[PDB]
Amino acid sequence: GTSKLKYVLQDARFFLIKSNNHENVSLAKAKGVWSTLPVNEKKLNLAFRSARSVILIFSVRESGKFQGFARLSSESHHGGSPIHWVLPAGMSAKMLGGVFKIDWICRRELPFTKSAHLTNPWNEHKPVKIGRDGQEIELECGTQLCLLFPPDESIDLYQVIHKM
Ligand SMILES: C[C@H]1CO[C@H](c2ccccc2Cl)CN1
């Protein structure tokens, strides 16, 4: 069913996360973590304190799809187990902010062709697939986008609900 999913998404905030490569999304799906550059780190920490649920919707650049979505379970923190992210050639792990813990809500893909009817008022009413990494997605658009994903029957949202 979709009822527990709708409960988790009620009054949530939503952010578009754009990844350079599938390997980092796979790492995030396996380890339940994400890390971003400091400008987006500050935005996500502010959002985590502001709303009952903060949802990250992931898309790998050039894939034509979203790869799933997850809920922040923590603000960012430093000093944990290091994460072997794939970095751009000139970059170092020291440029990153902290690590956010995340709980996956759906690890299934959604092609952009299925979201063409959804536009984001916070990005000039452009199709929701369009946006820089960290772009906030307005509540109604974000809720409908998450509801378009195929159900992920491997995930039990009972555990997600207890952290709220
Ligand atoms: C999952 C993380 C992995 O590191 C990326 C990065 C690190 C340092 C400089 C530039 C970038 Cl894009 C961002 N996404």
Walk me through this protein's architecture.
By secondary structure, the chain is α+β, with helices and mostly antiparallel strands. The chain has a single domain, classed as Roll (ph1033 like fold). 28% of the residues lie in helices and 24% in strands. A six-stranded mixed sheet has the order 2-6-5-3-1-10. The chain has a two-stranded antiparallel sheet with strand order 4-7. The radius of gyration is 15 Å and the shape is globular. The chain binds (2~{R},5~{S})-2-(2-chlorophenyl)-5-methyl-morpholine (OWZ). (2~{R},5~{S})-2-(2-chlorophenyl)-5-methyl-morpholine (OWZ) binds next to loops. The PDB classes it as rna binding protein. The entry lists the keywords ythdc1, m6A, complex, inhibitor, RNA binding protein. The assembly is monomeric. Crystal structure of YTHDC1 with compound DHU_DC1_011.
Topology of this protein?
Elements: H1 3-9, E1 13-19, H2 22-31, E2 33-35, H3 38-50, E3 54-60, E4 65-66, E5 68-72, E6 99-106, E7 110-111, E8 119-120, E9 126-127, E10 136-137, H4 139-148, H5 157-162
The structure holds (2~{R},5~{S})-2-(2-chlorophenyl)-5-methyl-morpholine.
Residues 24, 35, 85, 87-88, 91, 95-96 line the site of (2~{R},5~{S})-2-(2-chlorophenyl)-5-methyl-morpholine.
Q: How many domain modules?
A: 1
Shape: globular
As laid out across the biggest beta sheet, the strand order is 2-6-5-3-1-10
How do the helices and strands follow one another from N- to C-terminus? Answer: HEHEHEEEEEEEEHH
Give the helix proportion (percent range).
Answer: 25-40%
Biggest sheet: strands, sense, closure? Answer: 6 strands, mixed
Structural class: alpha+beta
What is the fold named in CATH at topology level?
ph1033 like fold
Question: Mind telling me the CATH superfamily name?
Answer: ph1033 like domains
- Give the CA-CA distance, first to last residue: 20 Å
* Rg over C-alpha atoms, rounded to the nearest angstrom: 15 Å
Number of strands: 10
Oligomeric category: monomer
User: How much of the polypeptide forms β-strand, as a percent range?
Assistant: 15-25%
By DSSP (H or I, 4+ residues per run), the number of helices equals: 5
Keywords: Isopeptide bond, mRNA processing, mRNA splicing, Nucleus, Phosphoprotein, RNA-binding, Ubl conjugation
Protein name: YTH domain-containing protein 1
GO molecular function: mRNA binding; N6-methyladenosine-containing RNA reader activity; RNA binding
Subcellular location: Nucleus; Nucleus speckle
